[PDB]
Amino acid sequence: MFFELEDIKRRHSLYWDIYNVQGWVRRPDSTLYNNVKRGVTAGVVASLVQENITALVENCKLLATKYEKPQNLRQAATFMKEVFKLENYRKAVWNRSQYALCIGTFDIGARLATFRWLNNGWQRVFAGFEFNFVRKIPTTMLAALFTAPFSVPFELARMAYYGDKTFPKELQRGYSSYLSALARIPFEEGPYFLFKNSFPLIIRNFFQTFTLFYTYDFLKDKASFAWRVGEQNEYACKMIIAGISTYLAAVFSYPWMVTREMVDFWPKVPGAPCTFNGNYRKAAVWIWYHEFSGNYFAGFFTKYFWKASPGMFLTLMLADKVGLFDQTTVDNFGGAGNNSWEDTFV
Amino acid sequence: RYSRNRQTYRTGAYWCLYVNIIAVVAFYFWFYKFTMNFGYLWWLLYSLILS
Amino acid sequence: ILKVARFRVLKMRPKISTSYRPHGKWGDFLACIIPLIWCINILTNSNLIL
Amino acid sequence: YDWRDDPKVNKDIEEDIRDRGWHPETYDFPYTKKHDDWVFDVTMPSQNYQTDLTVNIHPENKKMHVMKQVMRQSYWDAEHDMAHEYDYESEDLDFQCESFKSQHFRKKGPISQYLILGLLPILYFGTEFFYNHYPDEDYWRVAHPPPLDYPDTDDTDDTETFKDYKSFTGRRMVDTGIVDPLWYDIREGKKVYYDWAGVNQPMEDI
Amino acid sequence: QMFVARQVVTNSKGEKVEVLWNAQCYEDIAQLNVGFAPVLESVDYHWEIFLWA
Amino acid sequence: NYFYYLDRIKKLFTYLNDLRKHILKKYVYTINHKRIAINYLYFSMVTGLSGAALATMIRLELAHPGSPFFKGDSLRYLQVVTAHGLIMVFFVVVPILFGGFANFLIPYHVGSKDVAYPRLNSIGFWIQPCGYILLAKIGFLRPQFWRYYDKTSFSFPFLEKMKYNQYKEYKNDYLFYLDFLKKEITDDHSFFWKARKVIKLPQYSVFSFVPLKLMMWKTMINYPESFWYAASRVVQSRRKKVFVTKCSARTLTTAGWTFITPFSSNIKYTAVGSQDILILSVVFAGISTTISFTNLLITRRTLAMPGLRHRRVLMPFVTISIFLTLRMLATITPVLGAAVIMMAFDRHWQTTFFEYAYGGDPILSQHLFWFFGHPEVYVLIIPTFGFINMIVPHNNTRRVASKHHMIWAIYVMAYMGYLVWGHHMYLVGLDHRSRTMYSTITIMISMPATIKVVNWTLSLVNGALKIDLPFLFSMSFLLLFLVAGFTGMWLSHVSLNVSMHDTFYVVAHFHIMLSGAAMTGIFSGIYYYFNALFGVKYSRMFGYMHLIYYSGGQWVAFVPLFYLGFSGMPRRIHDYPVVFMGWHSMSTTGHFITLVGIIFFFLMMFDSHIERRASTSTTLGLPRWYKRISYYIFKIRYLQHTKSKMNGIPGSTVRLMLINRHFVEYEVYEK
Numbered sequence A: 001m002f003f004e005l006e007d008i009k010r011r012h013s014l015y016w017d018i019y020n021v022q023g024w025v026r027r028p029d030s031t032l033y034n035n036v037k038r039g040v041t042a043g044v045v046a047s048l049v050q051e052n053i054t055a056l057v058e059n060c061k062l063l064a065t066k067y068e069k070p071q072n073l074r075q076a077a078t079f080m081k082e083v084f085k086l087e088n089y090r091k092a093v094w095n096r097s098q099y100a101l102c103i104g105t106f107d108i109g110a111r112l113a114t115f116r117w118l119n120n121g122w123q124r125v126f127a128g129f130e131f132n133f134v135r136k137i138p139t140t141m142l143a144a145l146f147t148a149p150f151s152v153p154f155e156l157a158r159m160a161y162y163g164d165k166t167f168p169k170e171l172q173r174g175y176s177s178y179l180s181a182l183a184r185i186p187f188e189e190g191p192y193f194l195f196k197n198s199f200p201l202i203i204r205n206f207f208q209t210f211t212l213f214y215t216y217d218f219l220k221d222k223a224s225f226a227w228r229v230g231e232q233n234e235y236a237c238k239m240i241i242a243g244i245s246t247y248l249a250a251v252f253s254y255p256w257m258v259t260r261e262m263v264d265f266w267p268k269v270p271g272a273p274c275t276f277n278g279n280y281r282k283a284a285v286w287i288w289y290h291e292f293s294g295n296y297f298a299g300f301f302t303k304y305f306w307k308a309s310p311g312m313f314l315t316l317m318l319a320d321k322v323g324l325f326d327q328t329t330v331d332n333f334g335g336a337g338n339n340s341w342e343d344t345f346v
Numbered sequence B: 001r002y003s004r005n006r007q008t009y010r011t012g013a014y015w016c017l018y019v020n021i022i023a024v025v026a027f028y029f030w031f032y033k034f035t036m037n038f039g040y041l042w043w044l045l046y047s048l049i050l051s
Numbered sequence C: 001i002l003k004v005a006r007f008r009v010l011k012m013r014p015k016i017s018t019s020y021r022p023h024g025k026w027g028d029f030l031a032c033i034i035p036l037i038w039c040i041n042i043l044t045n046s047n048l049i050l
Numbered sequence D: 001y002d003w004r005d006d007p008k009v010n011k012d013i014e015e016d017i018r019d020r021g022w023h024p025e026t027y028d029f030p031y032t033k034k035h036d037d038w039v040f041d042v043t044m045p046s047q048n049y050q051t052d053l054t055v056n057i058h059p060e061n062k063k064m065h066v067m068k069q070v071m072r073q074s075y076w077d078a079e080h081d082m083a084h085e086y087d088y089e090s091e092d093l094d095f096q097c098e099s100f101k102s103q104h105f106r107k108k109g110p111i112s113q114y115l116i117l118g119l120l121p122i123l124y125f126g127t128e129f130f131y132n133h134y135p136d137e138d139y140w141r142v143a144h145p146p147p148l149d150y151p152d153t154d155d156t157d158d159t160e161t162f163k164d165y166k167s168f169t170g171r172r173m174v175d176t177g178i179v180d181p182l183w184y185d186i187r188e189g190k191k192v193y194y195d196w197a198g199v200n201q202p203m204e205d206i
Numbered sequence E: 001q002m003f004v005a006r007q008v009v010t011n012s013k014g015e016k017v018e019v020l021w022n023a024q025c026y027e028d029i030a031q032l033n034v035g036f037a038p039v040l041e042s043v044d045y046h047w048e049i050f051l052w053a
Numbered sequence F: 001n002y003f004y005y006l007d008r009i010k011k012l013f014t015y016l017n018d019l020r021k022h023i024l025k026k027y028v029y030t031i032n033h034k035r036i037a038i039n040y041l042y043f044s045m046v047t048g049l050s051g052a053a054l055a056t057m058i059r060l061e062l063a064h065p066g067s068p069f070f071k072g073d074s075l076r077y078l079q080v081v082t083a084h085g086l087i088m089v090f091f092v093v094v095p096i097l098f099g100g101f102a103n104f105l106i107p108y109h110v111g112s113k114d115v116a117y118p119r120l121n122s123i124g125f126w127i128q129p130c131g132y133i134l135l136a137k138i139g140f141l142r143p144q145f146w147r148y149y150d151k152t153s154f155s156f157p158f159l160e161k162m163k164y165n166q167y168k169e170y171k172n173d174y175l176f177y178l179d180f181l182k183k184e185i186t187d188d189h190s191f192f193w194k195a196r197k198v199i200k201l202p203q204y205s206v207f208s209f210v211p212l213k214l215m216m217w218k219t220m221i222n223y224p225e226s227f228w229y230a231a232s233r234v235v236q237s238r239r240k241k242v243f244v245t246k247c248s249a250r251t252l253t254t255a256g257w258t259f260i261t262p263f264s265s266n267i268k269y270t271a272v273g274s275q276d277i278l279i280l281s282v283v284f285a286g287i288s289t290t291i292s293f294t295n296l297l298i299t300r301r302t303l304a305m306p307g308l309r310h311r312r313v314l315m316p317f318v319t320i321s322i323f324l325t326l327r328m329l330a331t332i333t334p335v336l337g338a339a340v341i342m343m344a345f346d347r348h349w350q351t352t353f354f355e356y357a358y359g360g361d362p363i364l365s366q367h368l369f370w371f372f373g374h375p376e377v378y379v380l381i382i383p384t385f386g387f388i389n390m391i392v393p394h395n396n397t398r399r400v401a402s403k404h405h406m407i408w409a410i411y412v413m414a415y416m417g418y419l420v421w422g423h424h425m426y427l428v429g430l431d432h433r434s435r436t437m438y439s440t441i442t443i444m445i446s447m448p449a450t451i452k453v454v455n456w457t458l459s460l461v462n463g464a465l466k467i468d469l470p471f472l473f474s475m476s477f478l479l480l481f482l483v484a485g486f487t488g489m490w491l492s493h494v495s496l497n498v499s500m501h502d503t504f505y506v507v508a509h510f511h512i513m514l515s516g517a518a519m520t521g522i523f524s525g526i527y528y529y530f531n532a533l534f535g536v537k538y539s540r541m542f543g544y545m546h547l548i549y550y551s552g553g554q555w556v557a558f559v560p561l562f563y564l565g566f567s568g569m570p571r572r573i574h575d576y577p578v579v580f581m582g583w584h585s586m587s588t589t590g591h592f593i594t595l596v597g598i599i600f601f602f603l604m605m606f607d608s609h610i611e612r613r614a615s616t617s618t619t620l621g622l623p624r625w626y627k628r629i630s631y632y633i634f635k636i637r638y639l640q641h642t643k644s645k646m647n648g649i650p651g652s653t654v655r656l657m658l659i660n661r662h663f664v665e666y667e668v669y670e671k
């Protein structure tokens, strides 16, 4: 009627089941405003710490490349004080704090909001462990795919901003700050300058978010027997689960990010065609089908782990605290649990 | 020592198909009393008729 | 388990297994003491209850 | 000759980097081509420097060479294989020829069906449960509580339960705490569950 | 995969003969790689293990 | 030409017809053992998916009390459990081992062009689907197909024939036909349905309650269907209560996979239907096994290569185990056939073989069934040991430990399992003498298992290890088998067996045995012969994922069942005390993890076929380093191959400098 395809609306009749629980019921707190607010808060809080840690580590490396590394506690203390008072460190902290504000609000917040939207209603089993997590798997996959490319524009803007500072005065744009660079790049180079050849970042974000959120959600309920029967410390168990989740996310995400080094940084054989034709997707496929894992797992910690894992761990902890992973559990033999009360005690 | 043996058993394959059909149909008819309604998927019956 | 996982890999210390065929004759008898003790304990407890 | 089938001339053919140096169409069946041999000058010099005191080998300075992809499995030629396997019924003697080329070699073919192979558990379980609606049509549906006093009072008993909860005995039992608080309210002709009841509202009667 | 080594040996009759060391398998002809090229990869797949019976 | 496109289409049609003929010749009418084995493997995959679906149904029903899945259909739950057990036993493990693996390997390991009976091999392959369907679809199929809300009163009167019985006499005796016609017509050639709803309308003295679909004959006359549409789901009324019966006939159930009499062999308790179908399908599967083991044993005895005619030691352990299990099946199948035939006779002709009233022996049925049942599980397990016994030496570059002793241990287990069939009948009420004999032999059986375990452990020491996915699967198989056999030995305890009989402890024990060890060995063999089967190398990533998830799911699913058994939960019960909710939820979670592992296995196959890369033997042509010269040759070729494979990546210095100076994000410059 309105166009070629018609969205036919149809009415149906009443239907009900013996049990009204353990299915999908949208929680009242699961709304666009509340989910977005919680996700943005958690993402910003995590990203600030992550970027501050990254800046501190990088400034420490920069200072150590010119001065001998600490030999004892006093030398370490003075080294840290000098790093803190370094002029470059303060500017790096400011720029990376702006970058964290941009990321945690538009990427981590979006991931958390989508995850809550698509997985809030999966009720758990009363006095038991939630089974049929295969039902939740599609929701987490959908959220991860939807929110995967929300960080590539900001990351490319950051890379362009940092690479512009190292050009001569004639060839330097002269970006005042990261926010100014982000606001100017779309109008100078164009929107596609922030998305061209984004496969590595997109796949990295997907393999991070999916295997972090889903693994944490699965573990926090399946390993709950430790503190439900073994009387272990629930907070310690949750911390261990978050650590496992972030480590798995880093392991599954770094190999795809290694494609950048293989394609651009590895020396090219004179006269021979590029081993991957400059295609990050083909390089990732080669990594996937490669026999030896260590070859592309080299540099896992010196390059990516301490730049990504702490942020994911903090994000998981903050999401758990705010309640982005909280599900609704009610007794199935209670008043609202089931519609057949004649056999709940008989 | 053994002479050349044929490399295909078409009559055997069809005999096994008939054995399966007999087993299923006979068991369903004797114990379930159910006979497949070939008209439900009328196009396979029409496939037979055309063939 | 520790020895196999630490040294028996090709990378660390492979060993040239030149032995052709086994020669054990009573290792089965020697090993079956433990399951024999298991059976003896099971029989004793079961009969005491019975 | 047709340039449309030539990767060098036709730029629309997407080259597969993972199959560089391997041409399945050039296989022999049986394969009788040597593509591996002694290789030096990569890390081990081909010349002699055992006693050269002025030369020391540094294997770390390995120059990068062309990537050697793993050998690709043979790909079937449909017409040739069908002709080779084809035998004339009552015109061919039943025998095996001396030539070994008559051996029936396995060649990998289309890969599309293997997608369905990989997705088979999902497809099979969907057919078993969703397609056949097993064990019933309501188990997999989103759960909805029955409407108010539906289908019959003897089954629903919403009004009597509400009155009992609002009565003296109901309040005393709630105070005892063995019985949980009421989970629904009877509005003006409709039953509304509380947001903490953790259930959906009853479906409309239409 | 055809021969793992070769040697030239002078027999008791004074003639030099070539001896080739065949590739072997652990009791499993299925695991044995039947090929006719100096290649380690298992390229040839045979439906009839014994073509001539 | 004016019909170039038509010529191309004609070429396409010719190609399609030729391809159809080629496929029919090569995969349908073929007698090639390898192709038959591949088809057997695909059929086994389908049957395993069916069994997994049945197990999922069982686990969903057992998730929490109150029958969330079957909603009170105890008979349906029992039928589903029996179908699951029978399908898994007789149509997953047996087709995998004796169908695919045996048909694929025995010719290789005996040196025969084809099996002694290629026709019988093809027949055994093509016969499975009927039995598989019969034993799998009983849960769906019932003699009382209609649901509880179907108004069969709208259709049965049409089927009724006694209404017109009065005309039958006059159809042959015309003398008084006119007098009969001169009677009063009350309900001749007419149907009247009594009121189904209370109606108070003084205007009308009669009301019509005929079915709406049967209201008009003008459309019914030309419709060639039975009058079931009128009664099929025409009322909105429903009752969603567990206590509401869904099947009017309480006898439409199954007696499990054990066929316990007189429940199994009397129609008063297990009425006509799924029980009789299972009886006949069991006889059918027995005859199929007859054909299979006859073909395979005669193949070995008549077509084995010279030098391996009698030397069982030289053959690979899998082949030895397969032949021993085939001999066991040949020994035991007639007993099961006779017992099943007697059950059928009791059900139909009422021969009272198992009726105590006039000499019947209900315990005779259990004796006869278990006499085959225990050797059946031994047959299922014995071939699993061969997979590890072959894989561990292959990856360790070392001879297996005490192959002769392992062979003798498996043989002693095989031919001593014929005197322990009564451990499934301790409490039935048999004489204490027989009970003690069964217990003693059952506990004695533990020793050869310990011998095999110690041999497996010793096979891993002092060798050149080559870690691979088959090796990891073998390790998981060993880990599962240790606990499985330990739990079986504990069950051998008579006093504990009294409490653990027909409990979930036995369920956990035999699940850890079959689902753990047999499946781990099957997957290990699949990954060991992946190149021989599919012609391409497997994908190690999805392989590792499948291994991890499958092992974890098995453990998580079958460990809590031991706790349930210790608590005291009986078997074959769909509704249980509230105190088992946590462990049942854990079991369901483990089953779902196992299903995820199966998904990973299928994705592994798909990704391997996508990769379509030629496989390379790990031994490089030197399976055994019997001499230092062989070791040197292997080392030289291995180093050369490693250099060739590493020829396309940067050197250590370049990689280190790149990793060190990767970071390029600074703020201030100019030094």
Ligand SMILES: CCCCCCCCCCCCCCCCCC(=O)OC[C@H](COP(=O)([O-])OCC(O)COP(=O)([O-])OC[C@@H](COC(=O)CCCCCCCCCCCCCCCCC)OC(=O)CCCCCCCCCCCCCCCCC)OC(=O)CCCCCCCCCCCCCCCCC
Binding pocket: A141, A142, A143, A145, A146, A147, A148, A149, A152, A191, A192, A195, A196, A197, A198, A199, A200, A202, A203, A206, A279, A280, A281, A282
């Ligand atoms: C929600 C769904 C949930 C489903 C869950 C399913 C779960 C189970 C399955 C899971 C696995 C699924 C795998 C799918 C197939 C993947 C195939 C593959 O790997 O190759 C593709 C492709 C390979 O291309 P290539 O030729 O090899 O080039 C390699 C280059 O390095 C990279 O290529 P490039 O550099 O040539 O191009 C990169 C791309 C970059 O594009 C993006 O970043 C967009 C996101 C999708 C990109 C995907 C690639 C392009 C695909 C075709 C076009 C897609 C259009 C957009 C998406 C909708 C249609 C699908 O550029 C473009 O295509 C055009 C960009 C134009 C400029 C940017 C403008 C953006 C819009 C702004 C205005 C509108 C929004 C704001 C205003 C709104 C109104 C107020 O790789 C990728 O692009 C990334 C693949 C990553 C795979 C891992 C899993 C993550 C997948 C994420 C994709 C979806 C993101 C969210 C959008 C869709 C949902 C909303």
Ligand SMILES: CCCCCCCCCCCCCCCCCC(=O)OC[C@H](COP(=O)([O-])OCC(O)COP(=O)([O-])OC[C@@H](COC(=O)CCCCCCCCCCCCCCCCC)OC(=O)CCCCCCCCCCCCCCCCC)OC(=O)CCCCCCCCCCCCCCCCC
Binding pocket: A291, A292, A293, A294, A295, C001, C002, C004, C005, C009, C011, F460, F467, F472, F475, F476, F478, F479, F544, F547, F548, F551, F552
């Ligand atoms: C329980 C056993 C009972 C029987 C005992 C029998 C006698 C003792 C065992 C026999 C000897 C095994 C020796 C293994 C270590 C070898 C040397 C070494 O350090 O490894 C590095 C070595 C690679 O070094 P490379 O060759 O120099 O690398 C250069 C290239 O990159 C070339 O690299 P690529 O291309 O080969 O790729 C390597 C890549 C790709 O490979 C993988 O990703 C392997 C995936 C294995 C999955 C299955 C293992 C369990 C996974 C966790 C499940 C949760 C529960 C775990 C605990 C309970 C269950 C066991 O993996 C990695 O990136 C590194 C793997 C992690 C190494 C772990 C270091 C400790 C090893 C010592 C034993 C640890 C035992 C604790 C449990 C295991 C911890 C990992 O890895 C291998 O050769 C593969 C095996 C790695 C360990 C897994 C296998 C042993 C455990 C078997 C468990 C069986 C049950 C499975 C189901 C469980 C269900 C819950």
Ligand SMILES: CCCCCCCCCCCCCCCCCC(=O)OC[C@H](COP(=O)([O-])OCC(O)COP(=O)([O-])OC[C@@H](COC(=O)CCCCCCCCCCCCCCCCC)OC(=O)CCCCCCCCCCCCCCCCC)OC(=O)CCCCCCCCCCCCCCCCC
Binding pocket: A243, A244, A246, A247, A248, A251, A294, A297, A298, A299, A300, A301, A302, A303, A309, A310, A313
């Ligand atoms: C239920 C029972 C389970 C029993 C089994 C599990 C228990 C352990 C079994 C025995 C094996 C482990 C013990 C021996 C090895 C120990 C590790 C070692 O020596 O290597 C050190 C190595 C560090 O690098 P590096 O080798 O020293 O090289 C330094 C270079 O200068 C620069 O480095 P690069 O950048 O050049 O990169 C070099 C990197 C090259 O890159 C790689 O190779 C990375 C990929 C390795 C393989 C990954 C797959 C296999 C492992 C996972 C699956 C099996 C375990 C399952 C566990 C289930 C849960 C219990 O080298 C490696 O890391 C390879 C060797 C070590 C890792 C692989 C072999 C050991 C197995 C994994 C141990 C760690 C497990 C963590 C938890 C796992 C949860 C699932 O690895 C680590 O330190 C990672 C583990 C510790 C992570 C701690 C933080 C995690 C959470 C994030 C926190 C973020 C900040 C916030 C903190 C807040 C605090 C409140």
Ligand SMILES: CCCCCCCCCCCCCCCCCC(=O)OC[C@H](COP(=O)([O-])OCC(O)COP(=O)([O-])OC[C@@H](COC(=O)CCCCCCCCCCCCCCCCC)OC(=O)CCCCCCCCCCCCCCCCC)OC(=O)CCCCCCCCCCCCCCCCC
Binding pocket: B022, B025, B026, B029, B035, B036, B037, B038, B039, B040, B045, B049
């Ligand atoms: C012009 C004519 C064509 C001439 C050319 C040549 C034709 C060749 C035809 C060859 C036919 C081969 C046999 C076909 C069997 C089909 C079965 C079937 O689906 O039947 C049901 C089918 C559909 O019924 P439905 O209600 O959908 O489903 C069946 C009900 O569920 C349940 O129904 P039910 O309870 O009544 O059960 C009956 C059902 C079976 O249903 C069951 O499943 C129940 C089974 C109960 C079994 C109980 C016992 C258990 C079994 C084992 C017992 C023994 C023990 C074994 C074990 C050992 C124990 C010791 O099977 C039948 O209907 C029997 C066959 C009917 C007669 C068809 C014969 C056609 C002519 C053949 C000779 C032609 C050559 C003559 C010479 C020409 C030259 C002069 O009904 C039909 O027969 C319709 C198709 C008829 C086709 C006729 C031939 C093609 C021509 C059609 C006309 C086209 C226009 C022509 C114009 C010409 C212008 C010139």
Ligand code: HEA
Binding pocket: F258, F377, F378, F380, F381, F423, F424, F442, F443, F445, F446, F449, F450, F453, F481, F482, F483, F484, F485, F486, F488, F489, F491, F492, F493, F497, F500, F501, F502, F506, F510, F513, F514
């Ligand atoms: C593959 C299948 C399989 C295998 C191999 C076995 C093997 C054994 N079984 Fe079992 N069994 C079944 C499948 C199997 N069983 C099934 C399906 C049922 C129920 C059928 C039904 O009713 O439906 C059953 C029932 C059953 C019962 C009856 C329980 C009851 O009804 O109450 C008994 C009683 O003794 C028993 C004993 C044994 C013994 C002694 C072995 C021996 O073969 C095991 C010998 C091995 C060992 C004893 C291992 C030694 C251990 C180690 C070396 C490790 C030690 C390490 C530690 C202790 C840490 N089995």
Ligand code: HEA
Binding pocket: F041, F042, F044, F045, F046, F047, F048, F049, F051, F052, F055, F056, F058, F059, F062, F081, F082, F084, F085, F086, F088, F089, F092, F093, F096, F256, F257, F258, F507, F511, F514, F515, F519, F522, F523, F526, F557, F571, F572, F573, F574, F591, F594, F595, F598
């Ligand atoms: C081989 C035999 C076998 C196997 C593998 C299984 C596997 C499983 N079984 Fe079962 N079971 C039995 C044989 C088996 N079972 C028997 C004999 C009974 C007794 C019945 C009775 O007494 O009435 C029984 C009873 C039984 C009960 C008791 C029900 C009751 O009494 O109320 C339960 C409850 O959860 C159960 C669950 C499971 C689960 C979750 C698995 C999981 O392990 C299932 C996961 C799936 C697989 C393990 C196979 C998947 C297959 C493939 C992926 C294809 C592979 C193909 C190739 C490799 C080529 N089984």
Ligand SMILES: CCCCCCCCCCCCCCCCCC(=O)OC[C@H](COP(=O)(O)OCCN)OC(=O)CCCCCCCCCCCCCCCCC
Binding pocket: A019, A021, A022, A023, A024, A132, A134, A135, A136, A138, D121, D122, D123, D124, D125, D126, D127, D129, D130, D131, D139, D140, D141, D142, D143, F056, F595, F596, F598, F599
């Ligand atoms: C090893 C494989 C099997 C693994 C175990 C699976 C068990 C359940 C059966 C699913 C089979 C297909 C795989 C789908 C997995 C993801 C969806 C899922 O698991 O569905 C469960 C969930 C509804 O379940 P829920 O209502 O929560 O149950 C308790 C209610 N009191 O539903 C949802 O979350 C909504 C999902 C909507 C989309 C599902 C699409 C499924 C398609 C399957 C293939 C269909 C093939 C049809 C072929 C037709 C041919 C003509």
Ligand SMILES: CCCCCCCCCCCCCCCCCC(=O)OC[C@H](COP(=O)(O)OCCN)OC(=O)CCCCCCCCCCCCCCCCC
Binding pocket: A225, A226, A229, A230, A231, A232, A233, A236, A237, A240, F555, F556, F559, F560, F586
């Ligand atoms: C759950 C069973 C089904 C799943 C598979 C089981 C496989 C068993 C294999 C044997 C080895 C593992 C240990 C046994 C399983 C875990 C413990 C368990 O089953 O929980 C019961 C136990 C407390 O039980 P109980 O003392 O009877 O409580 C009575 C309260 N009035 O609980 C405790 O005391 C808590 C002990 C938790 C140990 C977990 C170890 C395995 C999980 C992976 C490693 C976790 C590492 C980090 C642990 C952090 C702990 C702070």
Ligand SMILES: [Ca+2]
Binding pocket: F061, F062, F063, F064, F065, F066, F067, F068, F574, F575, F576
């Ligand atoms: Ca239940």
Ligand SMILES: [Cu+2]
Binding pocket: F373, F374, F375, F420, F421, F423, F424
């Ligand atoms: Cu037994």
Ligand SMILES: [Mg+2]
Binding pocket: F501, F502
């Ligand atoms: Mg019993």
